Design a protein around this ligand. Structure first.
Ligand code: MG
Ligand code: MG
Lengths: 695, 695, 79, 79
RNA sequence: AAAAAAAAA
């Protein structure tokens, strides 16, 4: 017999029902969380034996949208769900980023959270359900875990926040925000707004957290009822003796080494002191593990840089907390792309390039909620020659598929509606050099490229990453944190928006609790920095160009009869294939008879127009048709005319005189007008050169 | 001028042509076996130096179907043969399962059998040829190999067995089973039957074996003719000292431990026993091998459990040999799938979900034998959390593509005929906890889900996994064998049928010398257990539900006049594209007048069939024919009622005098009755107002 | 701020333009060679310290053609 | 391969039939694709020589021009 | 012989 421990409550409008104990009894824990007929079956399994000699914590969060949830057989050729799509990877990262800071420091047991989507209802997004389920499952399992973390989605409709809006409500909403936080403080935010002020975004965050408190309480109650006993896991007791021994020699020397302005001399000096210290540590006692010394050195460097930045001393870069690194904006750097730009900020650089295409190129996304065509593709490539180290290129890693979406949220607020711009822009952004805040450099470069290719975006956008170092009640916000500073910064949040409002927000706070006031001050400083960046960017190019680049495919429209569109289709599309091959353009066909002629140069456009038009023009009374006899036989020559319908001039209908040889009557290359009296349907169209040959 | 060695023999109606020595000389041995114009080129490469510290036999059998065998450029976009398809993986496992238990114990040199298919007669299936080829290659190579293994594929026609049938015959057979065994015993059987009785299945097995004795003899002849010298390979001699100091010190305590009925006490006891023995044995000598110590301990405990079950003591589970584990059955456990079930037996369970799709979703796979469209998809998912360990979710492994086909073979016997139920059932089963016999739990759950979703299967169908243990003349047969017991069992079966008959008989013996009476007794016990499981399942769901789920797309089939299809549809498919784009349904047509209407909503299909009946409206006597004339001309009254139905109203039938304005006597939009007098060949239709106003 | 070093010459018929120093400063070297409106951006990254106990030279050359070069969104179903 | 045969152009409509039922039935019977032009040239495309032979024979039975000495199978259906 | 335009681219 099976004893399913079910616990259901009320969340917003829907009724979440947590249900454990019945399935996957062999995994460490598994809950089937269902909200309003959308059910996600999350399950956690964490090994007990620490892998001997581990340095990083290996948490993986697979998320699978099984397409039998909506109730459809998959569309792939193998008829089976395969590699996870970009959406599923995005939601996996969205589940991953809240929980990882909650596992206590010094935990290195492999833990894997496989949240599959068994059933979906089109109004309720499964992702929030999966997040709630992941938190509930982790809390039930007894793996060392500090929060039972809720998830909430808030939307802005009629200036009033709505919790967990349905997709139809979401279409009206200005802002879509996901806030996942512990009982104590927010723990992550991943937004996409529509140029809202900072106060509105902050209110949304605080509202979502204050409301998801309920899910948190109820998961705690379930854990208390039917959870497993907590693991007997103790962090490695801090070897204060060795730490103090290394510190007594290293503290002042590394403080002064970091105190000097030049970066590379400090690099070399601290590396040689590191070599000296590890040499002494090994020589004095071989048994001491190398990774322990590495951790000690990491602690020393982190501590010294944090103590420095807290006291107000200039950062490792040498800038004040406000100062943004110098920028250099370049546009049209690529000769033949539809539009390109190169946004270098400090050491972070991005070569962004926007390319227009016709509606046939829009990605057709087949996801659980519904089929959806995308007419704005943003891809973000992070090649390994950026950081400075070799590495195998390949399919995009999760972080690239996450930052692609982040930059796309950054730019989506200002893209034009399809009726105003009937193209499908695709923006790529290769990161030639990275030193921190790469995705926001990509947002700036994408705004630049779009403004250059000729897209009529509303206003340029720019993104500035930020940081925050807090100890006790003393906190200093950091602007444009470097890659090195990112380790030090407690909270990393990225703000990207036009001058008016915030297009996208992506907080990722990690330590203790940050008061609303802290977030407000940080957001205001980010607004200032973003205004400065936008000014500098406006100095280079202030308004999108007049028209698209000459290479860009222009749009030409022609109207044709509905049967004629079938005629131009032909057998499986042979006529259209031949037409595009001979003219070199791209033609789109609709059932209502509109024709979309898309070609770069107007000459190819008019070539397509004339070539198609000859077939489009119906045979009309009085007007002669141009026909060339392709084959001559002794018993008659038929003048092939085209259009699927050929009229034959039988040997008995040419003249009453005995036609002896067609060669002496019709010569190779005889372009003569043919008198067509009518168009018959029986397939024997009457052609007559006799009336045209009398004169 | 190298010279091949060819030996050809009759094997049924087809003739087989083994041939070696000509190609692939550098491989350890290669054999081109061709049966009746179907040729499979099999080659085997066996390394000579075992990798240091190898513990498991790394034999990997590949199998590639080259699409140039049938004479066809590949369909794939790259026009190149891709990764192994499902059929190729299945046939690879087919080749693999017989030849693995045949290599002697302790052999660990890598071996690779690559079987390519270079020419395929669309009648004789290649898999049997490839099995004969792998057998001949391995037995020719001189790699230590017990006996050459022959393959057969018995069919069942007119209650008379038939050897190795052709697809034309196979379309009429009830059963096809691939019995492949060496001369001594039947190594493997893989079956699919239309509810055949056990006795018939066993007769088929023994018949196939008695027949492929020929292939055995003739591969033996070819080996004696043109073979290679057997390798000098000797098994590692067992260490009598280690065996003694483990046995006399621990085996009695281990027997007393396995005497304990509870699982956890026994676990703790065996742990303390092995730890104590390892501790004292290292205390005697540290150089003694820990790995070999644990291996010998495992051998001891295996011998203990085997001696326990043979004597007749209760098994590790505590069940008697006949009795099945516990059972629990739920249906409709998911909210929005078309049908679902959660068949949990003991500690092995599966969450199966059947999802009906329209006839456009059927998988169309291109095989060498010929392009075949598959309208029943079974998919088997074995995620890592099921067995209780973390892992790498990804593409399905070979086990998953083997058990998918096994379960699909088990259910295919009872699924309905396409005339009685036009859909495309796809069944997905996710194992959420597996402890042996997972695929048979999947079969039970699939029958359950099918009966839930509403498909009218002919009868419930369930599967059980038997196990056989034999020593000398004493043999005991187990039921619902666990995963741990699998090491102990020698012969594994997987009988899976309805109460009337068997549907799948996959089996894989290892020991040599099982009389067919043993198999008869085991099959009888399996019939008993399967009747029990079906009795339990009978409580949850009695018969398939009358109506499919409301979410299901609903297919309605109507019959229409085959001649009027060109009158109502017309050329180019204009109106059919119009209806499919206005109603959003999929409509296809046959030459006889059969048309299916597929739409995910009832009312939408009602609208579609309304449109079809209006456009195909006959000349019903007494029904009003409403025509809307908005503008009147001199030549007639143009009224649009669709279907190309236009009539010329003559001026001589309006009034006797010449009309100066038609609007004085004929009203705009007024309803005119139109009686069709006759339907001519040219499509001429006339309108009759005078005779239709009064009648 | 940053300034590139460019040197362009006549090569047969077209005019090649070698340009370095502007982009990809963090790689070991990187030059964007273009030959009459056809640019190719090559970057070399060599490790400073050899792998301990290495026997074969691990040169790996990758050449990727971004479809946006021609001016077309790619054709692959994932675009 | 492609098999080409020339039959009288006027006698096509006898074998094509109303709405092309005869030709489509014959094609699904022989598994090939027959092509006919207004001048009566019969173009048979086939994926095999045997299917080509089957289609060509079925064409000779009915589609061929009426030949003297060719025997017609006449069966009464009702007395 | 009824019908845009390719995970297986
Ligand atoms: Mg950062
Ligand atoms: Mg088993």
């Amino acid at each position: 017999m099976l004893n399913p421990i079910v616990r259901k409550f009320q969340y917003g409008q829907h009724t979440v029902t947590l249900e454990t104990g019945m399935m996957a009894r062999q995994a460490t824990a598994a809950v089937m969380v269902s909200m309003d007929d959308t059910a996600v079956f999350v399950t956690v399994v964490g090994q007990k034996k620490a892998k001997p000699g581990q340095d990083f914590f290996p948490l993986t969060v697979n998320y699978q949208e099984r397409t039998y949830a909506a109730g459809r057989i998959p569309g792939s050729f193998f008829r089976r769900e395969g590699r996870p799509s970009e959406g599923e990877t995005l939601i996996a990262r969205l589940i991953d980023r809240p929980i990882r800071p909650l596992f206590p420091e010094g935990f290195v047991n492999e833990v894997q959270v496989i949240a599959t989507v068994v059933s979906v209802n089109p109004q309720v997004n499964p992702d929030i359900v999966a997040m709630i389920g992941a938190s509930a499952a982790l809390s039930l399992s007894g793996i060392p875990f500090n929060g039972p973390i809720g998830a909430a989605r808030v939307g802005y409709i009629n200036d009033q926040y709505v919790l967990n809006p349905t997709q139809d409500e979401l279409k009206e909403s200005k802002l879509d925000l996901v806030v996942a936080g512990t009982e104590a403080a927010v723990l992550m935010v991943e937004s996409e707004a529509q140029l809202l002020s900072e106060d509105q975004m902050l209110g949304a965050v605080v509202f979502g957290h204050e409301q998801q408190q309920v899910v948190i309480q109820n998961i705690n109650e379930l854990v208390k009822e039917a959870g497993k006993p907590r693991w007997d896991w103790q962090p490695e007791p801090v070897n204060e003796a060795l730490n103090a021994r290394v510190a007594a020699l290293a503290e002042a020397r590394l403080s002064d080494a970091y105190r000097i302005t030049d970066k590379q001399e400090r690099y070399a000096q601290v590396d040689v002191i590191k070599s000296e210290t590890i040499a002494t540590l090994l020589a004095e006692d071989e048994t001491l593990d190398e990774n322990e010394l590495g951790e000690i050195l990491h602690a020393i460097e982190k501590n010294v840089v944090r103590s420095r930045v807290l006291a107000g001393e200039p950062r490792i870069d040498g800038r004040e907390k406000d100062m943004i690194r110098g920028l250099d904006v370049r546009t049209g750097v690529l000769p033949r792309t539809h539009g390109s730009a190169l946004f270098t900020r400090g050491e972070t650089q991005a070569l962004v390039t926007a390319t227009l295409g016709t509606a046939r190129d829009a990605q057709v996304l087949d996801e659980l909620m519904g089929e959806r065509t995308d007419t704005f593709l943003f891809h973000y490539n992070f090649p390994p020659y950026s950081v400075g180290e070799t590495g195998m290129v390949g399919s995009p890693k999760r972080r690239e598929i996450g930052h692609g979406r982040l930059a796309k949220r950054g730019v989506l607020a200002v893209m034009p509606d399809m009726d105003k711009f009937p193209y499908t822009v695709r923006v790529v952004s290769e990161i030639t050099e990275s030193n921190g805040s790469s995705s926001m450099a990509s947002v700036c470069g994408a705004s630049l490229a779009l403004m250059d290719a000729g897209v009529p975006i509303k206003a340029a956008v720019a993104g500035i990453a930020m940081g925050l170092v807090k100890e006790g009640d003393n906190y200093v916000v950091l602007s444009d944190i470097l890659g090195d500073e990112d380790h030090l910064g407690d909270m990393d949040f990225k703000v990207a928006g036009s001058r008016d409002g915030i297009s996208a927000l992506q907080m990722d706070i990690k330590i203790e609790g940050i008061t609303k006031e802290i977030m407000q001050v940080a957001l205001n400083q980010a607004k200032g920095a973003r205004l400065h960046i936008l000014g500098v960017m406006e100095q280079a190019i202030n308004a999108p160009r007049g028209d698209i680049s000459e290479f860009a495919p222009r749009i030409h429209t022609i109207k044709i009869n509905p049967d004629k569109i079938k005629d131009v289709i032909g057998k499986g599309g042979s006529v259209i294939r031949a037409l595009t091959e001979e003219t070199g353009t791209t033609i789109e066909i609709e059932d209502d008879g509109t024709v979309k002629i898309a070609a770069t140069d107007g000459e190819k456009a008019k070539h397509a127009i004339r070539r198609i038009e000859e077939i489009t023009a119906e045979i009309e009374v009085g007007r002669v048709y141009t026909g060339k006899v392709t084959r001559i036989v002794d018993f008659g020559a038929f003048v092939a005319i085209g259009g699927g319908k050929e009229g034959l001039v039988h040997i008995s209908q040419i003249a009453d005189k005995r036609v002896e040889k067609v060669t002496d009557y019709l010569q190779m290359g005889q372009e003569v007008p043919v008198k067509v009296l009518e168009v018959d349907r029986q397939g024997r169209i009457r052609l007559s050169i006799k009336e045209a040959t009398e004169q």
